[PDB]
């Protein structure tokens, strides 16, 4: 069995590269961040432009939703993150502290905390209610490419060009584990599986890997695509069949069978690097976004 994703909508509006797309937890919206300094909100089902959210002084590399779908947090070249009230489009807090581009961000499931990763080589943990930085982790020795909380918020996983994936205790700030597979290619993305037991990691040698966190062992590798230069988002698709979904530098969305590691679909349409993919939380819907020669977001839908 293989999925049958087909192009449904193309969302045009950003005037520079799109950097990241994410579906709201309640399934109603898609948020996109862009090098054009804007966040845009679109209807998840109809692809309809809802609104533009502005305030950052420079382009934005990542955006993420709170668990109740009411807030967004954005990560910008202007060295700040901003927490936004989605309904009003207003900036509630500006999180200041990083000393170089902020590259990645995420809320914990409780959504009382935000974690951020930066080109300043640190990971920061922020109090959402007060806007205060709780911890500054000296996490890596090169830019931090991804940060993500596990299912109960007790752990944070980070990745870096230094070739490491590290797992941190949210409460104590202690580094609990370092994962590396003998060779040290730059790690460009990392994310916990929905059950918290695995970590999916991308490295800049055209390779994705599924790690068992507890055993600290690589279990599966996914290959065939192109990833040498960019920090591309990958996903666990779980609404239908169990797939791995990723962008690629040859302008395609790749879908692998999680268990067999076989490529099952390659989605054509984008005209530049697909930097970001996202999966709808309840329906078989994928969002993809591409870099500056393309500037569009695409919504793809499937029966399984």
């Amino acid at each position: 069995v293989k999925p049958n994703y087909a192009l449904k909508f193309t969302l045009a509006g950003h005037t520079k590269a799109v950097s990241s797309v994410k579906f709201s937890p309640n399934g109603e919206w898609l948020a996109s961040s862009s090098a054009d300094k804007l966040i845009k909100i679109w209807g998840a089902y109809d692809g309809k432009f809802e609104k533009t959210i502005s305030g950052h002084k420079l382009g934005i590399s990542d955006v993420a939703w709170s668990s109740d779908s009411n807030l967004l947090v954005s990560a910008s070249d202007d060295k700040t993150l901003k927490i936004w009230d989605v309904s009003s489009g207003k900036c509630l807090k500006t999180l200041k502290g990083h000393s170089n581009y902020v590259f990645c961000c995420n809320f914990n499931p409780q959504s009382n905390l935000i974690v951020s990763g930066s080109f300043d080589e640190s990971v920061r943990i922020w109090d959402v209610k007060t806007g205060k930085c709780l911890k500054t982790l000296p996490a890596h020795s090169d830019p931090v490419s991804a940060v993500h909380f596990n299912r109960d918020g007790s752990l944070i996983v980070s990745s870096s060009y230094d070739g490491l994936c590290r797992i941190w205790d949210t409460a104590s700030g202690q580094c609990l584990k370092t994962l590396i597979d003998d060779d040290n290619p730059p790690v460009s993305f990392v994310k916990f599986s929905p059950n918290g037991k695995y970590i999916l990691a991308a490295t800049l040698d055209n390779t994705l890997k599924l790690w068992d966190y507890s055993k600290g062992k690589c279990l599966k590798t996914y290959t065939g695509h192109k990833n040498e230069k960019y920090c591309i988002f990958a996903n666990f698709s779980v609404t239908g069949g169990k797939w791995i979904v990723s962008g690629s530098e040859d302008n395609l969305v790749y879908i692998w069978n999680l268990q067999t590691k076989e490529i099952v679909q390659k989605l054509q349409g984008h005209t530049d690097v697909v930097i970001s993919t996202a999966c709808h939380p309840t329906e078989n819907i994928i969002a993809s976004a591409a870099l500056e020669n393309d500037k569009t977001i695409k919504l793809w839908k499937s029966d399984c």
């Binding site: 590269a17 990241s20 862009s34 382009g59 581009y101 930097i275 500056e292």
Partner: peptide
């Protein structure tokens, strides 16, 4: 300054 406008949209050299 990143010419494309943000860090993620620049290639790693």
């Amino acid at each position: 300054i990143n010419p494309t406008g943000c860090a993620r949209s620049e290639p790693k050299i």
